[PDB]
Design a protein around this ligand. Structure first.
Ligand SMILES: CNCc1ccc2c(c1)N(C(=O)OCc1c(F)c(F)c(F)c(F)c1F)[C@H](CNC(=N)N)[C@H]2NC(=O)C(=O)Nc1ccc(Cl)c(F)c1
Ligand SMILES: *[C@@H]1O[C@H](CO)[C@@H](O)[C@H](O)[C@H]1NC(C)=O
Ligand SMILES: *[C@@H]1O[C@H](CO)[C@@H](O)[C@H](O)[C@H]1NC(C)=O
Ligand SMILES: *[C@@H]1O[C@H](CO)[C@@H](O)[C@H](O)[C@H]1NC(C)=O
Ligand SMILES: *[C@@H]1O[C@H](CO)[C@@H](O)[C@H](O)[C@H]1NC(C)=O
Ligand SMILES: *[C@@H]1O[C@H](CO)[C@@H](O)[C@H](O)[C@H]1NC(C)=O
Ligand SMILES: *[C@@H]1O[C@H](CO)[C@@H](O)[C@H](O)[C@H]1NC(C)=O
Length: 335
């Protein structure tokens, strides 16, 4: 349809790189925006074919190119060298805004699965604040669903299509490299994981009804997708999730199978210098980790799954557009 613009609340005195990027690329935010209901209207959306996702993907690539420069970038035959200073890195929310003569329709159905017709609709100038958080397997620091866990997929019959599970209740995950400098670990409270996967198995069962529902760890691929990978405080964490995606839900009951201990699952993590890039097909080399305690305390707010009687789901990811989709699903640009 058109070219969106971004509004953020960043300040120009922060050294933090999302703030810096935003202060030259985004406009400040309307302190009181203005919505506009239309509960008879009913319009369709398709989260899987939504141009806003492409545009924000562009922006985040831009942000990362200006903020997290690699010492080396290998793409094609070429290798680029640049200065790769350690930086202050903590994502801030970004709002996407329709320019003059355009609006953003927001679907207000709190159970809207992301495709098809939506009953109650609003008009808005901008989306909510969206933290551009790059990760795999687990979606972090998003917006919880308001009613019940929600299964999203372009086509749930096509097992090659990523599934986005939208949780309604955060599950804490705490990842730390304490004070091998490249070793770290994550802690999740097993009870709340227990619970979350049981409710998720419930919903998945609604969609696949005769079958037991198995959670298993990612089969194969680059480390970036076979582990829960993400950037914490500038450093690239790769966390093993085999004791996380490991359990069966059979008789309306979830049994967790992965090893726990003292009531918490603990992921073993490596901090890594050589990265397979999400932005494009290529490799990126970074400097060794900063010093001291590197810790991120995050909210798991959704999952990225791939489906292989029984249905089996393993963690997926790799296409960062899906992350943006998970927040942008309820919006389209009109007029
Ligand atoms: C359904 N298929 C699953 C799947 C699995 C892995 C992957 C894809 C997709 N990819 C993908 O979609 O890239 C977008 C894309 C397009 F969308 C597109 F249309 C293109 F034409 C294109 F060129 C392109 F790059 C990545 C390719 N990039 C690479 N091989 N170097 C590959 N993901 C990653 O590597 C990855 O996430 N790393 C990583 C690094 C740091 C952190 Cl913190 C992190 F959290 C993750
Ligand atoms: C969240 O969703 C699950 C199942 O979809 C439901 O059991 C639960 O009550 C919902 N709300 C919560 C957990 O606050
Ligand atoms: C989403 O809803 C539409 C219509 O409401 C339906 O056709 C589609 O199969 C649903 N998809 C999922 C993944 O629930
Ligand atoms: C979903 O994909 C399957 C292929 O796995 C195919 O039957 C069809 O094209 C799709 N079905 C629907 C309802 O869109
Ligand atoms: C995760 O840990 C398990 C058990 O130690 C190991 O077998 C598996 O290969 C690990 N996965 C990755 C991607 O390192
Ligand atoms: C679940 O965890 C156990 C030990 O924690 C491991 O041996 C097992 O292989 C895991 N399940 C799968 C399907 O990998
Ligand atoms: C999630 O948000 C918290 C608080 O804003 C932050 O400390 C944490 O590092 C974030 N997680 C990631 C992976 O950015």
């Amino acid at each position: 349809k058109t070219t969106l613009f971004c509004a953020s609340d960043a300040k120009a005195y922060e050294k933090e790189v999302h703030n810096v990027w935003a202060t030259h690329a985004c406009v400040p935010t309307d302190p009181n925006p203005q919505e506009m209901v239309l509960a008879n209207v009913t319009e369709n959306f398709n989260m899987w074919k939504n141009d806003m996702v492409e545009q924000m993907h562009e922006d985040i690539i831009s942000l990362w190119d200006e903020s997290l420069k690699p010492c080396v970038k290998l793409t094609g035959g070429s290798a680029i060298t640049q200065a790769c200073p350690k930086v202050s890195f903590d994502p801030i929310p970004l709002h996407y805004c329709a320019p003059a003569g355009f609006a953003i329709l927001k679907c207000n159905n709190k159970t809207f699965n992301g495709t098809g017709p939506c009953r109650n609709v609003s008009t808005v100038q901008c989306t909510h604040g969206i933290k551009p958080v790059v990760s795999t397997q687990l979606l972090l620091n998003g917006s919880l669903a308001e009613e019940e866990i929600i299964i999203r997929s372009e086509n749930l019959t096509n097992n090659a299509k990523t599934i986005i599970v939208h949780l309604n209740e955060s599950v804490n995950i705490v990842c730390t490299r304490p004070n091998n400098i490249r070793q770290a670990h994550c802690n999740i409270n097993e009870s709340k994981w227990n619970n979350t996967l049981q409710k998720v198995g419930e919903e998945l069962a609604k969609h696949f009804p005769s079958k037991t529902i198995k959670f298993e760890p990612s089969s194969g691929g680059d480390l970036e997708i076979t582990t829960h990978s993400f950037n914490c405080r500038g450093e690239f964490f790769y966390c093993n999730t085999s004791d996380l995606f490991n359990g069966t839900y059979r008789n309306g009951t979830y049994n967790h199978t992965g090893r726990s201990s003292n009531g918490t699952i603990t992921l073993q993590c490596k901090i890594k210098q050589i990265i397979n890039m999400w932005q494009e097909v290529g490799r990126a080399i970074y400097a060794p980790p900063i010093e001291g305690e590197i810790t991120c305390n995050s909210n798991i707010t959704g999952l990225l799954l791939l489906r292989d009687d029984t249905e089996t789901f393993r963690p997926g990811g790799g296409d960062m557009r899906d992350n943006w989709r998970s927040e942008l699903y309820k919006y389209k640009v009109v007029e």
